[PDB]
Design a protein around this ligand. Structure first.
Ligand SMILES: CCCCC/C=C\C/C=C\CCCCCCCC(=O)O[C@H](COC(=O)CCCCCCCCCCCCCCC)COP(=O)([O-])OCC[N+](C)(C)C
Ligand SMILES: CCCCC/C=C\C/C=C\CCCCCCCC(=O)O[C@H](COC(=O)CCCCCCCCCCCCCCC)COP(=O)([O-])OCC[N+](C)(C)C
Ligand SMILES: CCCCCCCC(=O)OC[C@H](COP(=O)(O)O[C@@H]1[C@H](O)[C@H](O)[C@@H](OP(=O)(O)O)[C@H](OP(=O)(O)O)[C@H]1O)OC(=O)CCCCCCC
Ligand SMILES: CCCCCCCC(=O)OC[C@H](COP(=O)(O)O[C@@H]1[C@H](O)[C@H](O)[C@@H](OP(=O)(O)O)[C@H](OP(=O)(O)O)[C@H]1O)OC(=O)CCCCCCC
Ligand SMILES: CC(C)[C@@H](C)/C=C/[C@@H](C)[C@H]1CC[C@H]2C3=CC=C4C[C@@H](O)CC[C@]4(C)[C@H]3CC[C@]12C
Ligand SMILES: CC(C)[C@@H](C)/C=C/[C@@H](C)[C@H]1CC[C@H]2C3=CC=C4C[C@@H](O)CC[C@]4(C)[C@H]3CC[C@]12C
Ligand SMILES: CC(C)[C@@H](C)/C=C/[C@@H](C)[C@H]1CC[C@H]2C3=CC=C4C[C@@H](O)CC[C@]4(C)[C@H]3CC[C@]12C
Ligand SMILES: CC(C)[C@@H](C)/C=C/[C@@H](C)[C@H]1CC[C@H]2C3=CC=C4C[C@@H](O)CC[C@]4(C)[C@H]3CC[C@]12C
Lengths: 604, 604
């Protein structure tokens, strides 16, 4: 909340400028500070509970801080006592200002090296511009001063300490945007670290520093981590045979693997870690050997199942209508057969076998799609475009509509045409889910997805506004006319549908040249042809062209992300005997229990 | 196979780390090596059959290699004895690591300079990252160390030696990606070469180094080869008159010429050699003087032949139907005349003359197109887009359909409309083959080809999926309705055709405003108008626009490649008296039997 933080900062500045000691410490006024510290409070606090030493350390005044530490040195151990800054000692502010002399003086005076800055300003939030952690070692690692890190570690800072989110100092080091010096600081902290190692300590969410580097899109820290796990077997000429380790990449026998955390991430940059050196090799092996033929087999089985469903839909049992067509505008000549009237002939028995196959396929689809929602969460399963969220919504709706059609068929309920048409359209449009397995058809589904949940939802309000206005105009111009001669605008729903058809130029303009149409229709339809047909439609065509160009710029990255997501899904759902553990065995060749991957690269 | 090569490498590293001698040679451990070589095997081998000297040479340990060569020097002549590395001595690994001292020590010890590295890793394959050949001189030329080349040649390496593919050292030099230093290495090896020259030695495929440089897209080596064949007549001011040699470019009196090998190549870069200095001049002379008027004459003759075929198709003999139209939905009022009933009047005799002209043209087309398939191969004749593969398929199908129509006409078989329509469409669409002879119409055929075998085959699966789903929905919504009022969806093939028409907006939406259509048709057609008409169609429009832009970026190169392919085809197929040998005579002007080409260029 910005209006509370501004009030806190203004009250802090008012309390600094009101007290003479805080004002003398702020401006580095040595004379007034010496006068006030010669004789008379040393423990007066501002609006945020900060002492005079915090004010002296905030404005980088070393001499005023030494003068304030000459008398009553316990201010080195006094933390702030207010909500936006809880526990912020002078050491944190001295480290953040990167003043080595003030940090050395505070550690000589005996400041707490394990004091936690548990305020609201130090938490990880979009309100806070920086997440530097809570312990002063985290601040010293994130700022980028190695001397302060060595001085804090030699004075007894704990490298294994965790903040309120559970993040260790490596986790807060990974999250920094300055990823160049952060690798050197990571190497320094790993050198100073000698139970389990600091690399295997997870946070409260459950992520290791390797997995957190994978999630947050930190490619440089990912390369720095993987350069400590490779093993160059031989470098012969331009050929180099590296042996990468898949212990923290494959994550075999785990609830959530590394690649599933990488792909199902809100950060955009994480897909770049699907283009790194061991990960791309690993997913290419797992896709070309196992993922692609199993995905093609599943696609062929689903296509045959949809063909059986379509064949059961076309041969739906219909009989002659018993009631006579009294209304001249009624064209219903057939109605649905009853349950006793149907399933008599042998062709109806073949249809019954096909319908049993269809309903068992729908039950299998529901049993395969429902527990993943409870496992991974409803917001992430239906939300991610790469994972196939809309396809999961479509296939769950299709299975529910097939079950609803079964219920309506067993209970002799008329009106199966509506769920059968819904199920046919959704089930056939869910065949395009299996187009992600091919590079020639992969990004096209993403193009249609970004044109439907993108430009279509951003232009349908303007389209519906124009449709409503011109449909109302076309209805009231033809309210006083004979509906037989021009019945395109006779009822307001039919006027809305006719104008929606005329927007996309899929029907002709209504014209009857043997009768006198009203002139207001002519002027209003000229306006509709200019504004809606010509101008606003071809704006949407250009928006779709820009969306197609935007996806086609990054088609390979998006198809690779779809490949990794499909490979992770097929490794998780299919049984283990169809998916052996990828990589070299390792134990057979005299090495440990780790599973390795050999990459031969052509350098120089 | 990667899973075998990884197993071989891991077994090799395990056998290195198991034996103490191989481990001492790997780590350059002098103490353990001296202890093991003082007293006790010197001939122990690893998983790939490599000796200890191969391990010492693989890790660039010169001192350990000299210690291993001090005792039992026969390890300098010991090759590996396993399948992925056959015959790989220590000299090949010493040359690949570019260690001149180790190569000199191995040649002093008496290593085999003609040992062949006939393993699977040294062959030319997409599995292997490098193709450096088999003989150590090929390795020394490909790595780029002139001192090793001179040391191997002075010790007795054969420059004329060929590997399993028949490639000499020049062939393996051309295939390298580092084409800058490869020209200098080529010049050094030609200087050291003093029967026929090394430039005229072909491989097992039949290609000279000039032809292999032409095929593989190596433009820099092509310039380096052509700078040894030019002859500057006079340089006056800014004008330079060079006299290029067409002995290895024109290839007169040969089964496969140089330009036919350049154009009909799987490599993309070979078309750049159609833009070089003598080749572009030569094909421009051969096209502007001979190829263009002969191609225009053939185009005019084929257009007149297709006009005669169309005129015979329009005047096809038809008589009144003998059977009465019993079915009210039947509109057949004419049927085909019999063979005895036809060919009676004088106009039928004119039609008979035209049909004889048509069938002789089809026989001529078959006799001109069939033996080229057996000559150049079915995979290359119908495969290359530049050569006109689809046009050859179309014209062979057209000739076969004309012959089938002749067979059905002679045997009084009804149903000539189907092969006549097939032959008319294919024969008229084969007129666009003759559009490659004009720069204003050249790349347009390539645009249509890349939009048909490209984006159309990559989008027709999604299009057919949407067509099948919405056709099934529109059929089952109108299964219970009267087919007289709205017969666009009455049968499932007719529903498929009507939805395919509604996809491309070539017919209107089915609407009958005098009767009550079902509302599910209205919602499903609104969905079809949004998803299929508006979104997915204009995605294909944008894909075709991107394909058109991609071809229009490189229109001149593609048209030049079409010109060279057409010129080669017309030089091969037409008789020799219409195609004199291009270039200056040479023998008349006191020079040799070579045929030259004069190029005047404006330098500076
Ligand atoms: C989203 C796009 C379109 C919305 C479609 C809504 C269906 C309306 C048909 C109602 C009907 O059912 O129509 C009428 C009901 O009163 C109406 O006029 C509807 C009045 C309101 C319609 C306009 C607002 C629609 C919702 C707007 C939402 C915000 C969108 C813009 C901002 C982004 C039934 O009477 P009738 O047409 O059979 O006869 C004609 C009358 N006599 C008997 C005298 C001949
Ligand atoms: C490629 C694009 C389109 C394929 C066209 C295939 C022609 C189908 C017409 C059959 C017929 O002949 O139709 C029906 C036969 O049973 C059917 O429904 C066909 C069932 C299967 C159709 C859908 C699958 C087609 C092939 C899919 C291949 C994979 C493509 C997607 C993946 C990329 C003949 O009965 P009917 O229509 O005359 O009367 C209607 C029935 N009463 C008598 C009760 C009124
Ligand atoms: C029947 C289907 C139901 C699907 C329901 C669930 C649908 C579902 O799974 O995604 C919903 C969508 C997700 O976002 P969306 O599809 O727009 O795409 C993501 C993101 O929102 C941006 O739009 C994308 O970048 P840009 O802005 O294009 O540059 C970004 O690309 P990248 O940077 O990550 O690479 C994407 O990650 O959010 C909505 O807008 C709701 C519209 C709902 C409209 C329909 C409501 C029924
Ligand atoms: C009736 C006609 C029959 C023709 C049969 C034979 C047709 C025939 O001769 O070419 C077939 C085609 C060749 O490849 P295609 O036409 O796509 O074009 C080549 C290549 O495959 C790439 O597509 C092109 O680059 P890009 O990817 O565009 O960037 C490349 O350009 P360049 O880099 O070389 O400059 C081209 O050399 O391969 C198929 O995909 C089969 C589709 C068959 C579909 C239809 C099957 C009946
Ligand atoms: C049955 C009729 C009445 C209406 C409701 C039908 C709507 C269908 C055609 C629409 C609704 C949402 C659309 C839709 C949702 C999301 C996606 C995921 C995207 O990555 C590819 C396109 C795809 C798969 C499309 C396909 C067509 C769908 C499924
Ligand atoms: C992009 C915009 C323009 C799209 C979303 C607008 C949708 C509206 C205008 C369309 C979509 C489906 C149409 C529709 C659905 C079904 C029926 C029932 C039918 O008996 C009368 C027409 C009627 C009532 C029309 C009214 C207009 C609707 C609701
Ligand atoms: C007769 C009807 C029923 C159907 C089969 C006809 C198909 C024709 C129109 C289609 C089939 C394949 C198409 C086709 C094949 C390939 C090429 C080569 C390309 O470089 C230019 C376009 C061109 C020449 C086009 C022309 C139109 C063709 C020949
Ligand atoms: C790009 C996609 C959408 C293209 C290739 C799809 C093709 C399908 C949908 C089209 C192409 C030709 C069409 C076609 C050919 C001929 C006939 C015979 C006629 O008596 C009934 C319609 C029927 C049976 C239709 C069915 C639908 C077909 C097969």
């Amino acid at each position: 909340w910005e209006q509370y933080r501004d009030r806190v900062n203004m009250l802090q500045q008012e309390r600094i400028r009101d007290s003479p000691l805080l004002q003398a410490a702020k401006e580095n006024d040595l004379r007034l500070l010496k006068i006030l510290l010669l004789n008379q409070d040393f423990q007066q606090r501002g609006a945020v509970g900060e002492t005079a030493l915090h004010v002296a350390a905030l404005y980088d005044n070393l001499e005023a801080a030494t003068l304030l530490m000459e008398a009553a040195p316990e201010l080195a151990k006094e933390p702030a006592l207010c909500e936006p800054f809880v526990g912020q000692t002078a050491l944190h502010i001295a480290v953040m200002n990167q003043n080595l002399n003030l940090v050395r003086a505070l550690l000589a005076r005996g400041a707490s090296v394990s004091a936690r800055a548990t305020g609201a300003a130090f938490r990880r939030s979009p309100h806070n511009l920086i997440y530097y952690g809570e312990h002063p070692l985290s601040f010293a690692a994130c700022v980028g001063s190695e001397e302060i890190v060595r001085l804090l570690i030699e004075h007894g800072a704990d490298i294994r300490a965790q903040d309120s989110l559970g993040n260790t100092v490596l986790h807060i080091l990974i999250l920094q945007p300055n990823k160049t010096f952060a690798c050197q600081m990571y190497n320094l902290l790993l050198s100073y670290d000698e139970l389990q190692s600091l690399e295997l300590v997870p946070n409260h969410q459950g992520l290791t520093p390797f997995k957190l580097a994978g999630v947050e899109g930190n490619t440089v820290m990912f390369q720095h981590l993987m350069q400590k796990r490779k093993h160059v077997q031989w470098t012969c000429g331009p050929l180099t045979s590296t042996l990468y380790d898949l212990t923290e990449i494959d994550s075999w026998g785990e609830e959530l693997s590394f690649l599933e955390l990488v792909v199902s991430s809100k950060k955009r940059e994480a897909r770049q870690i699907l283009e790194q050196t061991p990960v791309k090799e690993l997913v290419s092996f797992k896709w070309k050997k196992y993922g692609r033929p199993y995905f093609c087999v599943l696609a062929s089985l689903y296509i045959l199942y949809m063909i059986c469903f379509t064949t059961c839909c076309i041969y739906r049992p219909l009989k002659l209508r018993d009631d006579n067509r009294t209304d001249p505008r009624d064209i219903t000549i057939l109605q649905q057969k009853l349950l006793q009237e149907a399933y008599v002939t042998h062709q109806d028995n073949i249809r019954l076998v096909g319908e049993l196959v269809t309903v068992t396929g729908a039950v299998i689809i529901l049993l395969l799609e429902i527990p993943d929602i409870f496992r991974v969460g409803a917001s992430r399963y239906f939300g991610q475009t790469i994972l196939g969220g809309p396809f999961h919504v479509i296939i769950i709706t299709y299975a529910s509509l097939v079950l609803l059609t079964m219920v309506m068929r067993l209970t002799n309920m008329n009106g199966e045409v509506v769920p059968l048409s819904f199920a046919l359209v959704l089930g056939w449009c869910s065949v395009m889910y299996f187009a992600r397995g091919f590079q020639m058809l992969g990004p096209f589904t993403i193009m249609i997805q970004k044109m439907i949940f993108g430009d279509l939802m951003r232009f349908c309000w303007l389209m519906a506004v124009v449709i409503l206005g011109f449909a109302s105009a076309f209805h009231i111009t033809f309210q006083t006319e004979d509906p037989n001669n021009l019945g395109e605008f006779s009822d307001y729903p039919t006027a809305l549908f006719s104008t929606f058809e005329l927007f996309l130029t899929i029907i002709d303009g209504p014209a009857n040249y043997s009768v006198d149409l009203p002139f207001m229709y002519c002027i209003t339809y000229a306006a509709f042809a200019i504004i809606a047909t010509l101008l606003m439609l071809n704006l949407f065509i250009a928006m779709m062209g820009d969306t197609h160009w935007r996806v086609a710029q990054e088609r390979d990255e998006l198809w690779r992300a779809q490949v990794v997501a499909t490979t992770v899904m097929l490794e998780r759902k299919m049984p283990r005997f169809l998916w052996p553990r990828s990589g070299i065995c390792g134990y057979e060749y005299g090495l440990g229990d780790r599973w390795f991957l050999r990459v031969e690269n052509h350098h120089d």
